[PDB]
Design a protein around this ligand. Structure first.
Ligand SMILES: *[C@H](CS(=O)(=O)c1ccccc1)[C@H](CCc1ccccc1)NC(=O)[C@H](CC(C)C)NC(=O)N1CCOCC1
Length: 254
């Protein structure tokens, strides 16, 4: 397949409401779980021809996956996608939207950037308990609100491979190395220039493009709409910038 100079999953599959959604981890290192449930939400819709049109619960995956790492202290992508395939994940919106089986317990906050929400600050919440209980207004039992994948896999660390994957099957989750200068991002095409490592971050790649000959990946961060470019950032594409092409993981419902 020929790869177009630009692609945006929001524009290809606009009936799928989750794709254009920007979420917020709040004061919790749950990026690993957000990147997953976001991409799973997008993909469940894309791959089902719009039959599933849900927001999958971040807290269910964060709190219930025992093999996924340390919860709010950080996680592991392979087991997150495996949990979706084997156990599945229920529905659940942000705290503020109070929708679905298990909405997120934690409120929006500003992540090292200016805005209308309270600053997140440096402290992290304890990983929520695995409650296995839909909110009282949601009239489906927890186990019966589960959405399951069929397969999961890591994507080849090749630019064209990642592009074909996104274009054909939907947004992917991707891990990358976060350096201090990432905290200072307001807009533009990011590359690492200053600052030391802050570990890793997991996000959702929704597309790609090119501006003034500079190619980039287009990515949804999970730090609310006030961070970066209305919740998104762009990063250099084609040079494994901060290992952005080397930790891609996704999966399929069928
Ligand atoms: C999310 C990244 S983040 O918090 O949104 C972020 C932090 C700083 C800069 C930019 C983004 C989590 C943070 C986990 C954390 C780390 C240190 C203190 C508290 C919480 N990152 C992860 O979950 C990563 C995911 C990988 C795919 C990169 N994993 C991770 O941090 N760990 C793996 C499990 O062992 C613990 C560490």
């Amino acid at each position: 397949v020929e790869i177009p100079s630009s692609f945006d999953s929001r524009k290809k599959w606009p009936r799928c409401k989750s794709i254009a959604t920007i979420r917020d981890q709040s004061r919790c290192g749950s990026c690993w779980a957000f990147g997953a449930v976001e991409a799973m939400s997008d993909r469940s819709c894309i791959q089902s021809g719009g039959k599933q049109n849900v927001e999958l619960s971040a807290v269910d995956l964060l709190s219930c996956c025992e093999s996924c790492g340390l919860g709010c202290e950080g996680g592991i992508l392979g087991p997150a996608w495996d949990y979706w395939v084997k156990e599945g994940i229920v529905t659940g919106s942000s705290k503020e939207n109070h929708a679905g089986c298990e909405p997120y317990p934690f409120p929006k906050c500003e992540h090292h950037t200016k805005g209308k929400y309270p600053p997140c600050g440096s402290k992290i919440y304890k990983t929520p308990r695995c409650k296995q209980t839909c909110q009282k207004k949601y009239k489906t039992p927890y186990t019966q609100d589960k959405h399951r994948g069929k397969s999961s896999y890591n994507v080849k660390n090749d630019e064209k491979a990642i592009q074909k994957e996104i274009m054909k099957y939907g947004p992917v989750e991707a891990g990358f190395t976060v350096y201090e200068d990432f905290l200072n991002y307001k807009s533009g095409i990011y590359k690492h220039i200053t600052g030391e490592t802050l570990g890793g971050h997991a996000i959702r790649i929704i597309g790609w493009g090119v501006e003034n000959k500079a190619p980039y990946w287009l990515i949804a961060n999970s730090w609310n709409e006030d961070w970066g470019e209305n919740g998104y950032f762009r990063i250099v594409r084609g040079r494994d910038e901060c290992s952005i092409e080397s930790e891609v993981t996704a999966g399929r419902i069928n």
